[PDB]
C-alpha cells in the first residue's frame, strides 16, 4: 500500500459485530484497529488491517472522535461502510 490512499470497506455484521477492536481516541490522536478477530467479518473480508486508522463510518467523520464516540458510531451502525487508511507511523505510538 505505497500510496496510503484511504479505502472504502463494506462489512456486514455477524452475531457478534464487525469483528475488530478499536484503540485510541484518548487524546485527539484518532481511532485505530488494534485487533482483527479470526473468522469474523473484518478478517474474512481481508481488507482491514491492524494499524489502519478509521477515518469514517457510514459517512460520519471519526478522524477526531473520542474512543467513546467511535464506539457509539460503530456499535450502532448491519451493512457498515468504513473508510480506513493505513497509518503505520501513527500506529507506532500505540504498538512498536
Amino acid at each position: 500500500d505505497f500510496t496510503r490512499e484511504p479505502r472504502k470497506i463494506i462489512l456486514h455484521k455477524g452475531s457478534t459485530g464487525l469483528g475488530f477492536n478499536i484503540v485510541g481516541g484518548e487524546d485527539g490522536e484518532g481511532i485505530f484497529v488494534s485487533f482483527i478477530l479470526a473468522g469474523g467479518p473484518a478478517d474474512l473480508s481481508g481488507e482491514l488491517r491492524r494499524g489502519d486508522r478509521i477515518l469514517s463510518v457510514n459517512g460520519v467523520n471519526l478522524r477526531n472522535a473520542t474512543h467513546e464516540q467511535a464506539a457509539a458510531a460503530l456499535k450502532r451502525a448491519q451493512s457498515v461502510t468504513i473508510v480506513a487508511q493505513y497509518r503505520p507511523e501513527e500506529y507506532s505510538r500505540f504498538e512498536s
Binding site: 484503540v23 474512543h67 467511535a70 456499535k75
Partner: peptide, 6 residues
C-alpha cells in the same frame, strides 16, 4: 491499553 470490540 483499553480497546473496544465492535
Amino acid at each position: 491499553x483499553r480497546t473496544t470490540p465492535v
